[PDB]
Design a protein around this motif. Structure first.
Motif, PDB file in Angstrom:
ATOM      1  N   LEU A  92      20.046 -14.436  37.474  1.00  0.00           N
ATOM      2  CA  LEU A  92      19.979 -12.990  37.557  1.00  0.00           C
ATOM      3  C   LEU A  92      21.123 -12.356  36.782  1.00  0.00           C
ATOM      4  O   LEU A  92      22.106 -13.017  36.445  1.00  0.00           O
ATOM      5  CB  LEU A  92      20.016 -12.550  39.019  1.00  0.00           C
ATOM      6  CG  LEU A  92      18.893 -13.118  39.889  1.00  0.00           C
ATOM      7  CD1 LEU A  92      19.067 -12.700  41.341  1.00  0.00           C
ATOM      8  CD2 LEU A  92      17.536 -12.686  39.361  1.00  0.00           C
ATOM      9  N   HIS A  93      20.989 -11.066  36.500  1.00  0.00           N
ATOM     10  CA  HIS A  93      22.028 -10.328  35.804  1.00  0.00           C
ATOM     11  C   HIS A  93      23.177  -9.992  36.742  1.00  0.00           C
ATOM     12  O   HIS A  93      23.004  -9.934  37.959  1.00  0.00           O
ATOM     13  CB  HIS A  93      21.459  -9.041  35.212  1.00  0.00           C
ATOM     14  CG  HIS A  93      20.423  -9.269  34.158  1.00  0.00           C
ATOM     15  ND1 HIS A  93      20.742  -9.658  32.875  1.00  0.00           N
ATOM     16  CD2 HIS A  93      19.074  -9.168  34.198  1.00  0.00           C
ATOM     17  CE1 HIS A  93      19.632  -9.784  32.170  1.00  0.00           C
ATOM     18  NE2 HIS A  93      18.606  -9.494  32.949  1.00  0.00           N
ATOM     19  N   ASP A  94      24.351  -9.778  36.163  1.00  0.00           N
ATOM     20  CA  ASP A  94      25.513  -9.360  36.929  1.00  0.00           C
ATOM     21  C   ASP A  94      25.804  -7.911  36.573  1.00  0.00           C
ATOM     22  O   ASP A  94      26.654  -7.622  35.732  1.00  0.00           O
ATOM     23  CB  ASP A  94      26.717 -10.251  36.612  1.00  0.00           C
ATOM     24  CG  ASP A  94      27.843 -10.091  37.615  1.00  0.00           C
ATOM     25  OD1 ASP A  94      27.615  -9.475  38.677  1.00  0.00           O
ATOM     26  OD2 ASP A  94      28.956 -10.587  37.342  1.00  0.00           O
TER      27      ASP A  94
ATOM     28  N   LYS B 214      24.776  -2.143  33.450  1.00  0.00           N
ATOM     29  CA  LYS B 214      25.038  -2.963  32.281  1.00  0.00           C
ATOM     30  C   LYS B 214      25.472  -4.343  32.750  1.00  0.00           C
ATOM     31  O   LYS B 214      26.285  -4.467  33.666  1.00  0.00           O
ATOM     32  CB  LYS B 214      26.121  -2.298  31.428  1.00  0.00           C
ATOM     33  CG  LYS B 214      26.561  -3.066  30.199  1.00  0.00           C
ATOM     34  CD  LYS B 214      27.517  -2.215  29.374  1.00  0.00           C
ATOM     35  CE  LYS B 214      27.818  -2.846  28.028  1.00  0.00           C
ATOM     36  NZ  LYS B 214      28.439  -4.191  28.170  1.00  0.00           N
ATOM     37  N   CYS B 215      24.925  -5.383  32.132  1.00  0.00           N
ATOM     38  CA  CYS B 215      25.219  -6.741  32.566  1.00  0.00           C
ATOM     39  C   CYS B 215      26.543  -7.210  31.975  1.00  0.00           C
ATOM     40  O   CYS B 215      26.827  -6.975  30.800  1.00  0.00           O
ATOM     41  CB  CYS B 215      24.080  -7.683  32.166  1.00  0.00           C
ATOM     42  SG  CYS B 215      24.266  -9.382  32.751  1.00  0.00           S
ATOM     43  N   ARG B 216      27.353  -7.869  32.796  1.00  0.00           N
ATOM     44  CA  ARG B 216      28.646  -8.375  32.351  1.00  0.00           C
ATOM     45  C   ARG B 216      28.476  -9.541  31.385  1.00  0.00           C
ATOM     46  O   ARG B 216      29.333  -9.786  30.535  1.00  0.00           O
ATOM     47  CB  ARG B 216      29.496  -8.809  33.546  1.00  0.00           C
ATOM     48  CG  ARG B 216      29.939  -7.660  34.440  1.00  0.00           C
ATOM     49  CD  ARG B 216      30.688  -8.160  35.667  1.00  0.00           C
ATOM     50  NE  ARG B 216      32.020  -8.656  35.330  1.00  0.00           N
ATOM     51  CZ  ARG B 216      33.120  -7.909  35.345  1.00  0.00           C
ATOM     52  NH1 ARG B 216      33.051  -6.628  35.683  1.00  0.00           N
ATOM     53  NH2 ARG B 216      34.292  -8.441  35.023  1.00  0.00           N
ATOM     54  N   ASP B 217      27.367 -10.260  31.524  1.00  0.00           N
ATOM     55  CA  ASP B 217      27.160 -11.504  30.790  1.00  0.00           C
ATOM     56  C   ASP B 217      26.330 -11.318  29.519  1.00  0.00           C
ATOM     57  O   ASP B 217      26.565 -11.996  28.519  1.00  0.00           O
ATOM     58  CB  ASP B 217      26.501 -12.550  31.694  1.00  0.00           C
ATOM     59  CG  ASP B 217      27.323 -12.852  32.933  1.00  0.00           C
ATOM     60  OD1 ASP B 217      28.567 -12.880  32.830  1.00  0.00           O
ATOM     61  OD2 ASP B 217      26.724 -13.061  34.008  1.00  0.00           O
ATOM     62  N   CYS B 218      25.364 -10.406  29.559  1.00  0.00           N
ATOM     63  CA  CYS B 218      24.496 -10.179  28.404  1.00  0.00           C
ATOM     64  C   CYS B 218      24.454  -8.719  27.954  1.00  0.00           C
ATOM     65  O   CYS B 218      25.210  -7.881  28.443  1.00  0.00           O
ATOM     66  CB  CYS B 218      23.080 -10.693  28.670  1.00  0.00           C
ATOM     67  SG  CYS B 218      22.128  -9.743  29.871  1.00  0.00           S
ATOM     68  N   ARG B 219      23.557  -8.433  27.015  1.00  0.00           N
ATOM     69  CA  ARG B 219      23.491  -7.132  26.362  1.00  0.00           C
ATOM     70  C   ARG B 219      22.610  -6.153  27.130  1.00  0.00           C
ATOM     71  O   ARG B 219      22.478  -4.993  26.744  1.00  0.00           O
ATOM     72  CB  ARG B 219      22.914  -7.304  24.956  1.00  0.00           C
ATOM     73  CG  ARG B 219      23.758  -8.146  24.018  1.00  0.00           C
ATOM     74  CD  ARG B 219      24.018  -7.463  22.691  1.00  0.00           C
ATOM     75  NE  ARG B 219      24.663  -8.383  21.759  1.00  0.00           N
ATOM     76  CZ  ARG B 219      25.979  -8.522  21.638  1.00  0.00           C
ATOM     77  NH1 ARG B 219      26.796  -7.794  22.385  1.00  0.00           N
ATOM     78  NH2 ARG B 219      26.479  -9.388  20.767  1.00  0.00           N
TER      79      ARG B 219
ATOM     80  N   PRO C 256      15.151 -15.008  32.616  1.00  0.00           N
ATOM     81  CA  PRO C 256      16.468 -15.088  33.258  1.00  0.00           C
ATOM     82  C   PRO C 256      17.575 -14.498  32.393  1.00  0.00           C
ATOM     83  O   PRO C 256      17.357 -14.233  31.211  1.00  0.00           O
ATOM     84  CB  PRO C 256      16.679 -16.591  33.396  1.00  0.00           C
ATOM     85  CG  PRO C 256      15.981 -17.145  32.206  1.00  0.00           C
ATOM     86  CD  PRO C 256      14.773 -16.288  31.993  1.00  0.00           C
ATOM     87  N   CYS C 257      18.750 -14.294  32.983  1.00  0.00           N
ATOM     88  CA  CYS C 257      19.910 -13.833  32.231  1.00  0.00           C
ATOM     89  C   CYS C 257      20.503 -14.955  31.381  1.00  0.00           C
ATOM     90  O   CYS C 257      20.914 -15.992  31.899  1.00  0.00           O
ATOM     91  CB  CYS C 257      20.973 -13.279  33.183  1.00  0.00           C
ATOM     92  SG  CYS C 257      22.521 -12.781  32.385  1.00  0.00           S
ATOM     93  N   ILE C 258      20.543 -14.730  30.072  1.00  0.00           N
ATOM     94  CA  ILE C 258      21.149 -15.655  29.122  1.00  0.00           C
ATOM     95  C   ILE C 258      22.396 -14.999  28.537  1.00  0.00           C
ATOM     96  O   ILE C 258      22.285 -14.102  27.702  1.00  0.00           O
ATOM     97  CB  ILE C 258      20.178 -16.026  27.984  1.00  0.00           C
ATOM     98  CG1 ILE C 258      18.810 -16.418  28.551  1.00  0.00           C
ATOM     99  CG2 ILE C 258      20.750 -17.151  27.138  1.00  0.00           C
ATOM    100  CD1 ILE C 258      18.826 -17.689  29.371  1.00  0.00           C
TER     101      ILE C 258
END
Ligand SMILES: [Zn+2]
Ligand SMILES: [Zn+2]
Length: 60
Positions: free
Chosen positions: A8-10, A37-42, A56-58
């Motif tokens: 999942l997104h953060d 806004k996701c900390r890990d992706c765009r 999924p979140c990449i």
């Protein structure tokens, strides 16, 4: 069937200051409005479009 999981997104709450486009709905998130806004992706989205963000979140 046992439990498998998906990344999942953060999401963090960010106030819109630059021109932004919601990823799920494609529409622009206007100035001063809250965005996720996701900390890990765009990935960025409206708070109300959060559940529809591509999984999924990449991390980028
Ligand atoms: Zn993400
Ligand atoms: Zn949206």
């Amino acid at each position: 069937g046992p439990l498998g999981s998906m990344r999942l997104h953060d999401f963090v709450s960010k106030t819109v200051i630059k021109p932004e486009s919601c990823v799920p709905c494609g529409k622009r998130i206007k100035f001063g409005k809250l965005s996720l806004k996701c900390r890990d992706c765009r990935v960025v989205s409206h708070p109300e479009c959060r559940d529809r963000c591509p999984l999924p979140c990449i991390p980028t």
